[PDB]
Amino acid sequence: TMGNSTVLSFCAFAVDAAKAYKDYLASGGQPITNCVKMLCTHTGTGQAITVTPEANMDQESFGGASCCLYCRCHIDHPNPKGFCDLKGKYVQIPTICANDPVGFTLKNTVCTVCGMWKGYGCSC
Ligand SMILES: [Cl-]
Ligand SMILES: [Cl-]
Ligand SMILES: [Cl-]
Ligand SMILES: [Zn+2]
Ligand SMILES: [Zn+2]
């Protein structure tokens, strides 16, 4: 197992950091650790990204920036305005995937309707 700094550096300087992290994970690499876990009641709304921790009974809440590959790699976010949708907020991760919050936020998308993760919490 490589070390967070080794993994993050490798992704940070790749032309496509997300691809590099996804390909590492698919090869069996250990997920990036030391994300900031929140203590919370687990009777929250279950929404994916919120101003305060909102985990329901099936989720864990994390500090948003600590689960953001771009934030963890100190690089720009892959959009024009460069705004980060996780920084300063709290991200709800299904506990099944809580061993890899960085990879989870990367791969998934918040349902525009119910504000929950598509394919997990989203029951639309
Ligand atoms: Cl390391
Ligand atoms: Cl700890
Ligand atoms: Cl969810
Ligand atoms: Zn970020
Ligand atoms: Zn939905």
Author numbering: 7 to 130
The authors write:
The coronavirus SARS-CoV-2 protects its RNA from being recognized by host immune responses by methylation of its 5’ end, also known as capping. The two zinc fingers are thought to provide structural stability to NSP10 although their detailed function remains elusive.
To our surprise, T12I, T102I, and A104V were still the most frequently occurring mutations, with T102I displaying the highest mutation count. The structure was determined by molecular replacement and refined to allow comparison with wild-type NSP10. Both structures overlay with an RMSD of 0.26 Å. The only observable difference was the loss of a water bridge interaction between the hydroxyl group in the side chain of T102 and a water molecule. The observed TM values for all three variants T12I, T102I, and A104V were 41.3 ± 0.1°C, 44.0 ± 0.1°C, and 44.9 ± 0.1°C, systematically lower than the TM value for native NSP10 (47.4 ± 0.0°C). For NSP10 variants T12I, T102I, and A104V, the measured Kd values were 1.46±0.38 M, 3.88±1.39 µM and 2.37±1.36 µM, indicating that as observed for NSP16, the variants either show values very close to wild-type NSP10 or display slightly better Kd values (0.37–0.99 fold). In summary, this signifies that the three variants have only marginal effects on the NSP10 binding affinity to NSP14 and NSP16 and show either the same or slightly improved affinities for complex formation.
